[PDB]
Amino acid sequence: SRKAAAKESLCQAALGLILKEKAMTDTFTLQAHDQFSPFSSSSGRRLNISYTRNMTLKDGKNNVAIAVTYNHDGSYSMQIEDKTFQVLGNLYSEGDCTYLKCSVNGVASKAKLIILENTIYLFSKEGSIEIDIPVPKYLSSVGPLAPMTGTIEKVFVKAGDKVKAGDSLMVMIAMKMEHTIKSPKDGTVKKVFYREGAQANRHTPLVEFE
Amino acid sequence: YHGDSVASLGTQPDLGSALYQENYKQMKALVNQLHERVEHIKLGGGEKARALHISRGKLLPRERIDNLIDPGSPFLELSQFAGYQLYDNEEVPGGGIITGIGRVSGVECMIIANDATVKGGAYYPVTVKKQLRAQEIAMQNRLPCIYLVDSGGAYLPRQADVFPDRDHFGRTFYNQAIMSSKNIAQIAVVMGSCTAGGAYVPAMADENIIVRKQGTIFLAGPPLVKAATGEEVSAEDLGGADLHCRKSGVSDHWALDDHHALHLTRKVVRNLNYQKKLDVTIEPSEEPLFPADELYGIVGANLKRSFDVREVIARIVDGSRFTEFKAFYGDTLVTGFARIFGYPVGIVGNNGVLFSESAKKGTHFVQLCCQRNIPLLFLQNITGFMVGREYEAEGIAKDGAKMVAAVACAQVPKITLIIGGSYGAGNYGMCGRAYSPRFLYIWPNARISVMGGEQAANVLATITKDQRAREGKQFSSADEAALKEPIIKKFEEEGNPYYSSARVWDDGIIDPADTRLVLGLSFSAALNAPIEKTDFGIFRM
Amino acid sequence: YHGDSVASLGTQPDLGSALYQENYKQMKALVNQLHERVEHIKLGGGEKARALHISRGKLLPRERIDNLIDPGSPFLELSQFAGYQLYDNEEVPGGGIITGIGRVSGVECMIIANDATVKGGAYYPVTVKKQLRAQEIAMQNRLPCIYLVDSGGAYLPRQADVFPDRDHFGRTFYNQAIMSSKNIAQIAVVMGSCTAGGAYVPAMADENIIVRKQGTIFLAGPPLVKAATGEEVSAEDLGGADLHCRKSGVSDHWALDDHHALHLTRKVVRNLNYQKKLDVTIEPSEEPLFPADELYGIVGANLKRSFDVREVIARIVDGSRFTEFKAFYGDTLVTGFARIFGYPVGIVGNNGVLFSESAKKGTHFVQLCCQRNIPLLFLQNITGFMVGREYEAEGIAKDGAKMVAAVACAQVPKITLIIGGSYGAGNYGMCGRAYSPRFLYIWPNARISVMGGEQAANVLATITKDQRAREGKQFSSADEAALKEPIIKKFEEEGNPYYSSARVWDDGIIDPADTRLVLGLSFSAALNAPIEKTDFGIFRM
Amino acid sequence: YHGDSVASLGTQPDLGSALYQENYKQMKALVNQLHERVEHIKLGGGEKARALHISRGKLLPRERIDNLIDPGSPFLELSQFAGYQLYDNEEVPGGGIITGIGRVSGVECMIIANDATVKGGAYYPVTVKKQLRAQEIAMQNRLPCIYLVDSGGAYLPRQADVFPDRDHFGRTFYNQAIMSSKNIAQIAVVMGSCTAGGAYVPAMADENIIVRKQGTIFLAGPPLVKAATGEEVSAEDLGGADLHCRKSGVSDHWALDDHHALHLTRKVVRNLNYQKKLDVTIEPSEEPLFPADELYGIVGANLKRSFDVREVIARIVDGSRFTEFKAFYGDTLVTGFARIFGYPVGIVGNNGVLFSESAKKGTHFVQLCCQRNIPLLFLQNITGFMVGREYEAEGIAKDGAKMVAAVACAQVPKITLIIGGSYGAGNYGMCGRAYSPRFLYIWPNARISVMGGEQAANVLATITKDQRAREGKQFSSADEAALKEPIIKKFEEEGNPYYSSARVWDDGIIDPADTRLVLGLSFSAALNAPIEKTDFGIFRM
Ligand SMILES: CC(=O)SCCNC(=O)CCNC(=O)[C@H](O)C(C)(C)COP(=O)(O)OP(=O)(O)OC[C@H]1O[C@@H](n2cnc3c(N)ncnc32)[C@H](O)[C@@H]1OP(=O)(O)O
Ligand SMILES: CC(=O)SCCNC(=O)CCNC(=O)[C@H](O)C(C)(C)COP(=O)(O)OP(=O)(O)OC[C@H]1O[C@@H](n2cnc3c(N)ncnc32)[C@H](O)[C@@H]1OP(=O)(O)O
Ligand SMILES: CC(=O)SCCNC(=O)CCNC(=O)[C@H](O)C(C)(C)COP(=O)(O)OP(=O)(O)OC[C@H]1O[C@@H](n2cnc3c(N)ncnc32)[C@H](O)[C@@H]1OP(=O)(O)O
Ligand SMILES: *C(=O)CCCC[C@@H]1SC[C@@H]2NC(=O)N[C@@H]21
Ligand SMILES: *C(=O)CCCC[C@@H]1SC[C@@H]2NC(=O)N[C@@H]21
Ligand SMILES: *C(=O)CCCC[C@@H]1SC[C@@H]2NC(=O)N[C@@H]21
């Protein structure tokens, strides 16, 4: 079965993500007119205070919160649950592969860093660990009223009918087109408020359910 | 930074639903018919005139254009259907002229070629109209003009419709004199026989090329000096290449044959000292996430049946990414920011009738785009302007005039695409032909009239019943049938896409796949001119 | 060419001398105290209000700023000490608002966040002052403003000091209307409850984001319509996100929660069509040759003991290279050309009192820098203007007015740093707060008054002895002690760095190491506006 | 042509109605009290200091102004009530300075005279504020400044409130350096003793006049060099007229006494090569058809009782002719076109609360006036902004922001007159002090706060009941009386006209008769600058 990641492995995943974001910043700068300028160094240097970034990584099924403090000397202090790790490192290339060079509490290591959509892959000589980046809700999310003052074409339902969602309820022709009223609702039509052929008015009720 | 993820538009349609299959079959039929009609237009005046044209050693005009532009480069041809069934028994293919935006020596140019296989290069009224439209494209977008003159002069029995008015033949030379006063280069290659109105085209151009023993320039030809002064002259020594290149000085470069003229033209364009400078921001281009025959399945051919315009924007923009603006207020207008080939586009699309809130949403959006210098793309699918009483009480015609006033005053490149109907003053709110868009293409299912046939017949019948009610008698079923026949027939005839592009009311009927490419081509040509600051009028609040 | 070698400034100090060790201990104490005070300011209104703020599902405002700017990007926060011990028993941390220059979507922006944990986002007078200072930074440097509105309206018992004047609350909307008329983008994210003066902040902005079931905009809230019209309404249906996003049309984008609002804000900034273009020359940046805790050892905390300003310039400029200008004429002013992060800087630093020759040297230098479009950095350490008789005979006040007139008329970016005292009209000769520098930081050892105290007490005593000498009696030791107590106490209290940045008389107390970084950040922000030609007045020769 | 007859405004009131008689008695009492207070302010520092001032041979400062301006010419004095009951036990009449627009040598100038009888010409904080307001009037309207310097330098006990900030004493010299860089002439007449901050006023001026044996300029006086350097010098040979006029070269003209200095000043103004050129159209001036003590009868002093603003416009405009604009739509705002002394004026007047239609009517009118270059006159009588629920549903705060954005962006001369109350964001919609009007006068019955009193007490009480309801107990009658005392008292104290003009929140309390004359004077001064094209922001439709 899959085993839980060690806190040191979560530090490596967090560091790889931070350095990948830096890489994106660096390749933006290489295309800029304002070259050599500050703001391009992803140092997190606040004035008179320190910056702590709170990120969450998903280890299998469970979420872990990692508080990453940006230190003045370029190191990171990553507190995972309670334990603080001194995390340093950088990226380097060998041919077409990107490697993440780490030092966590004086312990040096090297792993291949591959980030594909949401999943952080760390390939080392002791195993392979997959850490997922959570996806926020706003990137994963994707009775009736008469629209215009028009004449009624056809009434589909009666007093006492049971319909479904996405079902043709009434049809009206307005000026040049054809707009069918369809039901988002659930329940029973007790009321057909407009007789066939009448002129409905915008923002108006056609069918009522109890 | 530009690394953080976003969402995209569009959903995959039901490929098995009968709505999709019927829509696909109808729009495929329209597109196949469009293809076979333009392949017949591609021949020109028939194989007899083509044989007599190549028997004199000339190229055909599309061969001239293929040898002039860069190798492998695309060619955006404008108004391929001009003159289509327009004159009663005369066939004028392509208008008798070939206009297009091409790429010569790494510069995007406007190319105007006299197709001499049709009527000997005579100038019909639609020929003058199509040429003047090409010239105003080149003056708006600051593109050099290359005229490949092989003319025949102005037709005689249509001479009124060609000669005196403001936008008649003489405007052509006006447009050469003004463009060359703005440093927009004119180049004329004389490959034919310029007779007395065509003779002003190379003489008003900065640089000429004339072909040895083939091109002739004279203000009065041999039958014209016969009828005017009474004189017999031979044509090649009245106005041939040797006299003009060596004695009179009308021509600047001298070519052996047509290949030499086109090679010299590419040299002349390279010595123009032109460098294209962009002022918008550019990003890496990216293809969408959906195909474009899905647009055949989604749009169909039924204009009474509505669809969603977000499905179209999902299939023409970069990565199908779209930042929607005011998505819940006035939701019969879809406004937002996208990218086409790396260019920033503000898109305005119709999704229903125009209420008051939709027009206010559009006015806010057009002011935003003009403040930031972002080009506009209008996607017209209109049916009306919300007729009613509680609507006129609010100020609906107080609110559509703000939309009209903002679209008129806007100084960014605007491009219209008519993907459906386009009726009434709604057509003016969404940048119709009168509002100077840079380009205006249509899809083969579009319709454009003042209303919709039924409405015109009903209004005429009810107003003549009111009118006759000073005395008052009815002819009920007779009046009904006899007004519902010839009005629905007329409006459906004149609302056709081929009727409207037989005139020069638009820049082309395009295939719904090709849409994305065509927009990109048009938008890059429209970026040759620097975008100027917009001043608006008085917004009536 | 740029290959030929040059010399550099600076010498390594005696790390063992008692002067260095005492200076290091004093400036280390000042910097540690500055750090602990700003760490207490970082919490805001205490842990009770933070718990009730996150119990409603909101972020804390510094979390909002961290999630809005680019990841890892620095943040230049302005006026962290506004409101510090300013009101008598009320604690207003940070002013009640958080302003700073950050980097959003690769664009450097000004961010103004209502810190709603302190007094429910009420607007104290220092809150209005600090916000207006941020807005004039953004109008001078042409930076887009992002307002993160979580307001509470204008405080009541201080209402005079907030409402009517020119630089009172209403100026805020003036600055939004003028900046947006110059194409400087305004973006408002409504995360709170805008009550009747805050309600004009999103309605004056080009693009809005409002959060579902959390952000509310109304010109008159529920107790306000109670006291004004007598009406009970619920707040989330009086002015909630659904009404404004769907019916009234005040809002343009609709967010689920705060993370969605910040993600949408980064999208909106990316669709601004902005590209930063530089007009100065840039060279490869290089770090200096000396550390920056040596500045603790060199400056110290004793303002009666002078030092050399060339030691500071040696530790803030590129490679410690410095081209000195007129090094032997008027040597109490050090002028020259250096580079900070590759940007060309003309530096003017004080080394003593201002004579006449020093002011003429400075006027020549400022004309040189404005002719070449080089930004200016003033390093104030002033004690006076050379009082004397043989000095007024020459025209000392004829020569300091030339310095004042040249610094006032200069149209390049000017940045001041007060590293020591700053007294009298000398403060005006070296670009004080009245002379519109872009930024003005201070070090924790600075002092600023109209004099130094002793002088004010002596002038008042001698002036009142002269004044009373119309009759004339003395109270010698009594008058001496009783005027030397409350005048030295007052001047030393009001000359403090925390007194001056408790108001918005400067943009921050900075640590002498951080100096180099802060200058670089400020200078790059100051290069977003194109440098205009300088016109001078009349130099009185 | 201009011969065809038109109609006029106004009706004659009932002189016998008890409403008219009570209103007349109340406004007559207010105007008599205003007259006696300004006659006490006219003396300055009392007869002791005036006797010691004329014992040294000087004129009094109002005598200096009477001898400087053209004979018989009117004088528009600004802020006669600055410093009125502002400091606790110190009386500062007139602010300690006298600013006004006068007419010198046929040129309309700004005159700034140090009234040396009060505190020896010391600079209180309201003195710096009033002088800076005069200087920004002269920079906006392009008027030459004449400073009659008789100073005493900063004040000291309140040195913080005078020295360091942006709009503190040093701004004065900034405004001299910038105005003289725009060819706006500065003239300084040194009649006094300029001590170290006043000494920069003649040295920053293009032309000086200093008086023999009376005027002294030094950057450090005798007690100042005593306390600073330790030196005894005599003042008239440290900085007298002979040293500056003959050796140092600070002064340009040399006067025998004050009459010679004023005669020389009139010469200097005549050699300025200035010619006033008008760009508006002028018609023959004509007096109204109604008197102006009828305004006492119509307005009264009761702010809870409304009146019609058309009665005021009937009594201040040329011939009482008024072309009303949109008279039936949004009839709580009265907009129209009139003439004052032959100048075209667009008038915007309040007649009730601001609805949505009134704000749209005002935005349309302000765009019309900026398109035609017509100056604006706002007549504020505001109570609110229509609090309600069906009003926020429409977009009331979407519509008042358009009014605010149009008034802010407008580049024509705007003048405000507050004839009644002025509360809330309504104050910003009708060109309050923050929106840079050229001038802003008030009538003696006006009130200005962030909202009436009662409302603030009710909002504070209901929000503290809500606030305490986390635990919840009441102190009903106790809380009621103890919050309704000190809030109504505070708001009625700080809403007074004398409270607001004791600061420099306006340019004067004027008598309702004098209104017409004062407007004419202000409008002609405001026409010395050429009207620039207006750019608006983004109107949120
Ligand atoms: C006066 C003006 O404003 S323009 C009138 C110019 N005057 C002329 O008549 C010049 C016409 N003559 C020519 O130069 C030749 O006709 C060319 C070069 C234009 C045509 O090339 P050719 O190889 O000679 O073909 P040709 O002219 O013999 O015949 C081509 C057809 O074009 C027609 N045509 C050519 N010019 C004109 C014209 N100006 N008006 C009407 N018809 C014309 C001819 O009648 C002929 O018609 P068809 O289709 O019924 O046979
Ligand atoms: C009328 C004007 O334009 S001026 C004031 C604006 N108008 C008002 O509505 C004043 C009333 N307050 C409000 O605006 C709102 O109801 C809010 C923002 C105070 C509601 O905030 P909540 O999240 O409910 O917190 P709460 O209302 O308890 O306010 C917190 C504290 O700040 C104070 N406060 C908040 N807003 C204001 C304000 N505008 N003026 C004075 N005090 C205020 C409250 O007295 C309260 O007191 P405490 O700190 O001593 O406990
Ligand atoms: C403070 C600075 O930055 S520069 C000023 C420093 N030095 C001075 O100005 C002190 C001496 N200068 C004077 O004020 C001179 O008195 C003059 C010449 C300008 C005025 O004329 P004098 O005949 O001296 O008037 P005199 O000194 O009698 O004025 C009396 C009052 O002016 C007040 N005063 C004058 N200047 C100042 C000042 N700069 N600060 C505070 N109070 C002042 C005194 O408090 C005194 O108060 P009183 O009413 O109790 O007597
Ligand atoms: C077909 O287009 C339906 C009827 C047209 C609507 C009419 S035509 C003229 C009026 N203007 C407008 O925008 N709508 C009305
Ligand atoms: C402390 O700053 C020492 C005394 C101040 C010098 C005085 S104050 C006013 C005069 N102006 C100036 O530049 N120096 C003088
Ligand atoms: C006195 O002026 C009556 C109450 C004030 C109205 C309130 S104050 C803040 C809101 N803004 C506005 O224009 N009206 C509301």
Numbering used by the authors:
A (entry chain C): 499 to 640, 648 to 715
B (entry chain F), C (entry chain D), D (entry chain J): 23 to 563
Recite the paper's sentences.
In contrast, PCC and MCC have their BC, CT, and BCCP domains divided into two chains: the α subunits contain the BC and BCCP domains, with an intermediate BC-CT interaction (BT) domain between them, while the β subunits solely consist of the CT domain. In humans, PCC and MCC catalyze the carboxylation of propionyl-CoA and 3-methylcrotonyl-CoA (MC-CoA), respectively. (**A, B**) The side view (left) and top view (right) of human PCC holoenzyme (PCC-apo) (**A**) and MCC holoenzyme (MCC-apo) (**B**). Both holoenzymes are dodecamers consisting of six α subunits and six β subunits.
Using the same batch of purified BDCs ([Fig figs1], H to K), we also determined the cryo-EM structures of human PCC and MCC holoenzymes in the acetyl-CoA-bound state (referred to as PCC-ACO and MCC-ACO) at resolutions of 3.38 Å and 2.85 Å, respectively ([Fig figs2], [Fig figs3], I to L, [Fig figs4], I to L, [Fig figs6] and [Fig figs7], [Table tbls1] and [Table tbls2]). The overall structure of MCC-ACO is also similar to that of MCC-apo, but alignment of the CT-N subdomains shows that the position of the BCCP domain and the conformation of the acyl-CoA binding pocket in the MCC-ACO structure are significantly different from those in the MCC-apo structure ([Fig fig4]). Consequently, the covalently linked biotin moves from an exo-site to an endo-site that is deeper in the pocket formed by the CT-N and CT-C subdomains from two β subunits ([Fig fig4]). At the exo-site, the ureido ring carbonyl oxygen of the biotin is about 8 Å away from the main chain amide of the catalytic residues G437 and A438 ([Fig figs10]). In contrast, at the endo-site, the distance is shortened to about 3.5 Å ([Fig figs10]). The acyl-CoA binding pocket, also formed by the CT-N and CT-C subdomains from two β subunits, switches from an open conformation in the MCC-apo structure to a closed conformation in the MCC-ACO structure ([Fig fig4], C to E), with the major conformational change occurring at two helices (residues 474 to 517) in the CT-C subdomain and one helix (residues 243 to 252) in the CT-N subdomain ([Fig fig4]). The acyl-CoA binding pocket of the CT domains shows a different conformation in the MCC-ACO structure compared to that in the MCC-apo structure, and the covalently linked biotin is relocated from the exo-site to the endo-site. In the crystal structures of PaMCC in complex with CoA, the CT domains also adopt a different conformation in comparison with that in the apo structure of PaMCC.
